[PDB]
From a paper:
During eukaryotic translation initiation, initiator tRNA does not insert fully into the P decoding site on the 40S ribosomal subunit. This conformation (POUT) is compatible with scanning mRNA for the AUG start codon. Base pairing with AUG is thought to promote isomerization to a more stable conformation (PIN) that arrests scanning and promotes dissociation of eIF1 from the 40S subunit. The factors eIF1, eIF1A, and eIF3 bind to the 40S ribosomal subunit and promote recruitment of Met-tRNAi in a ternary complex (TC) with the GTP-bound form of eIF2, a heterotrimeric GTPase, along with the GTPase-activating protein (GAP) eIF5, to assemble the 43S preinitiation complex (PIC).
A distinct class of 40S complexes containing eIF1 and eIF1A was used to obtain a map at 3.8 Å. This complex, referred to as PIC-2, contains a mass of density next to eIF1 nearly identical to the one tentatively assigned to eIF5 in py48S (see below). The similarity of PIC-2 to the previous 40S·eIF1·eIF1A crystal structure from T. thermophila (Weisser et al., 2013) allowed us to build and refine the structure and use it in subsequent analysis. Compared to the empty 40S, the PIC-2 complex displays a head rotation of ∼8°, and a further rotation of ∼5° occurs in the py48S. We observed that binding of eIF1 and eIF1A to the 40S subunit evokes a rotation of the 40S head by 8° that likely facilitates TC binding in the POUT conformation. The rearrangement of rRNA in the P site observed in the PIC-2 complex may provide a rationale for the improved binding of TC in the presence eIF1 and eIF1A (Maag and Lorsch, 2003; Fekete et al., 2007; Cheung et al., 2007). In both structures here, A1756 of h44 is flipped out to interact with eIF1A (Weisser et al., 2013). The NTT appears ordered only in the py48S and was not seen in either the PIC-2 complex or in previous PIC structures (Weisser et al., 2013; Lomakin and Steitz, 2013). Although we did not observe a large difference in the position of eIF1 between PIC-2 and py48S, the latter exhibits movement of eIF1 β hairpin loops 1 and 2 away from tRNAi, thereby avoiding clashes with the ASL and D-stem. We proposed that some of the unassigned density observed in the PIC-2 and py48S complexes corresponds to eIF5 and that our py48S might represent an intermediate state in which the eIF5-CTD/eIF1 interaction has not yet provoked eIF1 dissociation from the 40S subunit following isomerization to the PIN state.
Residue numbers in the entry:
A (entry chain a): 2 to 98
B (entry chain X): 2 to 97
C (entry chain V): 1 to 87
D (entry chain N): 2 to 151
E (entry chain R): 2 to 89, 95 to 126
F (entry chain C): 39 to 255
G (entry chain W): 2 to 130
H (entry chain b): 2 to 82
The structure:
Amino acid sequence: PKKRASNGRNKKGRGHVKPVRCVNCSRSVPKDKAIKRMAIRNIVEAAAIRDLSEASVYAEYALPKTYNKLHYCISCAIHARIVRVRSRTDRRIRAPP
Amino acid sequence: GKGKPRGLNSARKLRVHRRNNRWAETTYKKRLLGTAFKSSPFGGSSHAKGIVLEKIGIESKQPNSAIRKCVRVQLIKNGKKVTAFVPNDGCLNFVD
Amino acid sequence: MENDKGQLVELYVPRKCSATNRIIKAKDHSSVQINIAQVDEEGRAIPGEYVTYALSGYIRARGEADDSLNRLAQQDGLLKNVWSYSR
Amino acid sequence: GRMHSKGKGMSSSAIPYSRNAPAWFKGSSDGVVEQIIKYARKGLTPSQIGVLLRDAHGVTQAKVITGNKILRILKSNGLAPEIPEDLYFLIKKAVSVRKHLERNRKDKDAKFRLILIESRIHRLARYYRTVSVLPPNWKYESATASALVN
Amino acid sequence: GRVRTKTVKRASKALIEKYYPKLTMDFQTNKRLCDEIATIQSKRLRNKIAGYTTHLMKRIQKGPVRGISFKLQEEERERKDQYVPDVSHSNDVLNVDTQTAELVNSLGLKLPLSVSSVSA
Amino acid sequence: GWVPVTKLGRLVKAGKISSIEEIFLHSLPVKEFQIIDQLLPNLKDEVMNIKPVQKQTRAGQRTRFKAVVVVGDSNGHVGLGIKTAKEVAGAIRAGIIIAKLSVIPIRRGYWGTNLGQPHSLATKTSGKCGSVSVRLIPAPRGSGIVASPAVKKLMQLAGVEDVYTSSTGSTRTLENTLKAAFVAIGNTYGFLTPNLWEVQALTPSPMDVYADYATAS
Amino acid sequence: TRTSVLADALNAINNAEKTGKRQVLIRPSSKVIIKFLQVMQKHGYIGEFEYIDDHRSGKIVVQLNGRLNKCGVISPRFNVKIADVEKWTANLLPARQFGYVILTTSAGIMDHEEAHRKHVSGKILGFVY
Amino acid sequence: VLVQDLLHPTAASEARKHKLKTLVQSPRSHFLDVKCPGCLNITTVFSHAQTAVTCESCSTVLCTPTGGKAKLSEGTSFRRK
Amino acid sequence: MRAKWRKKRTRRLKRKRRKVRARSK
Amino acid sequence: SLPSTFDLTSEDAQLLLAARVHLGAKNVQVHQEPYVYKARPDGVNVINVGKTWEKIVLAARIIAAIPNPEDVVAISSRTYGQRAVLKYAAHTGATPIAGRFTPGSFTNYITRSFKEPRLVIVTDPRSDAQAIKESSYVNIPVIALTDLDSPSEYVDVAIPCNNRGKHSIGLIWYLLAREVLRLRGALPDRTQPWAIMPDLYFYRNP
RNA sequence: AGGGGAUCGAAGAUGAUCAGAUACCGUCGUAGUCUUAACCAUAAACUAUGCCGACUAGGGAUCGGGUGGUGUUUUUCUUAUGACCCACUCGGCACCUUACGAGAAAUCAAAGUCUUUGGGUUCUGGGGGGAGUAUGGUCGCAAGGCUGAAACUUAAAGGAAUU
Ligand SMILES: [Mg+2]
Ligand SMILES: [Mg+2]
Ligand SMILES: [Mg+2]
Ligand SMILES: [Mg+2]
Ligand SMILES: [Mg+2]
Ligand SMILES: [Mg+2]
Ligand SMILES: [Zn+2]
Ligand SMILES: [Zn+2]
């Protein structure tokens, strides 16, 4: 039967949506059976920051972060990303803390 | 209300629907098409005489094991070569 | 009910709920008898004599039961003002 | 629940409980009638006339004030259109759609809508034929429809 | 790994329930008492029970514990209670609201009022 | 050995409740087994079937024994106990106990006109458990129990003489069928006849009368 | 389309009774519905009921006694022939005994007992047991 | 729930509920009797418009039609009914 | 066996049959 | 049927107001609640004080019906009322279940804590809900202190009240106790607040 | 049948990997992928839930409109508007709790109001295989589609849960 009410979700009053391609697999995937993670990483590493501060010019510098919405297609997201897998009672949860 | 017009002047649609539906029931289909007369070796009869062409021990289906002491029989009326099993403790000593 | 020439049969004559008139069943492991005391001036709560209700399981289960009880009270004069006809 | 979409609207004009005139709202009946006839003369179509009456003048519904309807009144004075108002509007719409289609060869949605319009027209035509407002065996469609409009 | 077992703990609890007096804090006396009152087919077990009882006694000096309050421990809580004379008059006379005032208007006779506002 | 837990048990032991009709009137819980035995000495108890029931392990399996037990008389009280224990006789005993706890009344009624004593049901009434719908239907005098074996036995236990049944769904799972039948029987005392428009008194319960003799000293 | 109106009336009533509402509002409400309700009343199944003269179609407010169990209207109005009546009652009613099959006849919307007494029957509308 | 003595509810409930879904349906739309800064005359004007509404003869324009209730022309006094 | 694959094989068979028929003609 | 002196006396009303029984209740709602005399701008509904008091009286009149004193059982799990419950029990007959309820206690006639009530009084149908549910099994009316935000499931008579916490719950308990004492008990007169203090109750040392 | 032919890419090459790989991975690469004329009518074309209609249980949200606010806020004085805000309210797309009903169950405010069986209507199914085959019609430029058997053949094939 239906493993989920929503299924791979979000296609509700939406006919047949547009396909986003994967990051890892580069498999095409619907923007709902999607699994999108926003990776706001520092443009540098934490051990690389100190060195930069030591050597670099300008008053401390603001330092930029990069912004990537990475679409881990369903399967690849079970090479430990979001996803994880859950219990039947654990799947009725729409929160990440 | 589900399917069938619970209508009142509805009846022809109901009757036709029933007719159409019936064919999916096997027995009725067999009766109507006349499968009995065109096929199934016997002429839709209970019993038929035939002629012992050749005695064949048919090797039985699974779990069970044995040889099943049947007869390839050519029927007289249609001329069809069936295999009729013979009951009990040999009795091919009777059949020949 | 009655066997022709009088003679009552059918035992265990069902309690009916006071709110819904729906029969209180035999294994109504949900229903209740509510007992409310007839009351008098200075101390006085008059033992032995109560105004009594039965509430059938089903209404209670539904949730709307308190209001029904209030209604019953307002009718038998055990309350005034509490519950109105129009909501 | 809507003749052509999956939509199930219930936006609708309501009506008051009183069939009697709304007391204080003055004027008369004759005046109202005169106004209606003037509007008819000016080329407005029933619904429009009613609208005009309601807002600017002291009118609720002509039925309440005069006694008879708008359309009935028009018929009495002999000023009513030959093809019923709604039907006429439908025909006009159809014509417009046809024109659009003539220009745009690939516009499938428009074609589909045109089909629906045509169907609606047919329904309306049938009912007019039944109540005898369009003279029988008169069909309203594509070639003659344009001619009919104006 | 010296976690006292279920059984010992249960026994200790029972002892505390039935004989909360005659459990004089220190081990030695308590052990002897345990040996006397409770019938243990062992010695080590008895000792363990005694130890646990002593621990419980120590705990019960520094408050009440769950599953350990039996009549004589109850009356040292129930009576050792009741503050009282501050009431719910204090901080001016009857602080109310607009809605509250309105409510009062319909029901009660004559009551003192200090009306606030309440807004977004 | 007797020894009562619960107020009702104590009351029964004192002998201030005469018959289970009164209990039924106030829909009283009968968690204690002995009460029914005390009040109904007429209990004819029948075993239906004891299907073995399995549970799988790393080695072998667990063969428990689900035994369906009916309980009854001829008066119109019926029990139904289902139990699943390892020991079969023990399981049966447990089932019996359960059935006794359960025991329920029946509005035995008239086929058509009163004449003499009710040995049918009031109303075409049904249950449904799992997916087995037992309907029962008030048969006329002498027309017997018209039922599948299990249901027939249940009816006999009840003290119904005449009943048509329309048992539908997979009645071959006996337990479910039995449950459905029991449910249907229970339902009898729910269908408001016009013989029931009449307003009742609402008695204060045995719990609220013989209050002092109840509860432990 | 609200094809049949009696059906609608009964359905809502039934629902109300099932929940334990003491009152129902019926939307369209005809002569026929009113007659049916009157019949029900006559044998005490329904309490008071109030037809609002909407300056439109109708509206019925009902008072429920809790004496209702199921009120059904049968789907086509089968023309019914005095012996057919017996069959219908056997099928539709919980006893050879009580409750009523509410058939419309030439003499008016009666129950079934009344019809039998009067010796006239016609089409069936509902029933009340 | 359970009992709601139906026919007579409070005016507030009626006001809240959709003006079609009530008991006896009445429109909850008024007739603004409007006065202009020009002449000393009042016009009976429906609360909704669908038309740009001029006066008895004057080209004053009383109300501009929005989706619902008509937004009156800047500074014009109006009664009710 | 996959249903799709089965269907494909059936189609192929049909095509072959058609070809044979054509040849015969 | 009516004492007529049993109108809400001004002092009592004042007490209630101080407790903010009526002038709590979060802006959310349960649909089965007409104990609400208007609503406040931002976050508050207001509970018809008089109605609440009358229902409390009714509740008392129900606790007055049961002849056995320690047969009526009070129950609170949430801390904002345990003490109050205990006080109530002390004052009346009443067995209390403060804290962890023991799920299946009115059923399970084998438990070390077997109470069989004929009436049960509850603080929170939001927390103690288990107890209420259990009551369904064995047929007990449930008198409860409803916040007008909580369910009415399995509740026969529910005093409308505030359950934010603090002085409201305790006050209500105290009032109920007082009323019960008035109706068959030691304290005989209509007037006088007596030694029965509202602050014997409430939430003390945290 | 023309154009346009970037990218990717059925076929093909072609490198590995493998006992083997005209499979998975790598690198090229026509057809195609765009598009204008036409056709073909199928998809897990799925919400695997026919469309209408009525009713029964709450709840916040969210989009679309619409009234009710001496509500906030923008200030260019009073402002008049917009954007919020609160209370509604129709219409929708869904969702969360309860089941007092269902259902075999999973679950469902509909899959409810069905043995207490009857609002109106279409269409489809009758154990599994054989078989969506064969034949015949047809509609296709073909690939194919719509319709669609039986002979045989077997006691299971299924579902939904549990250990
Ligand atoms: Mg949509
Ligand atoms: Mg290779
Ligand atoms: Mg290749
Ligand atoms: Mg298809
Ligand atoms: Mg499909
Ligand atoms: Mg088949
Ligand atoms: Zn991927
Ligand atoms: Zn003017």
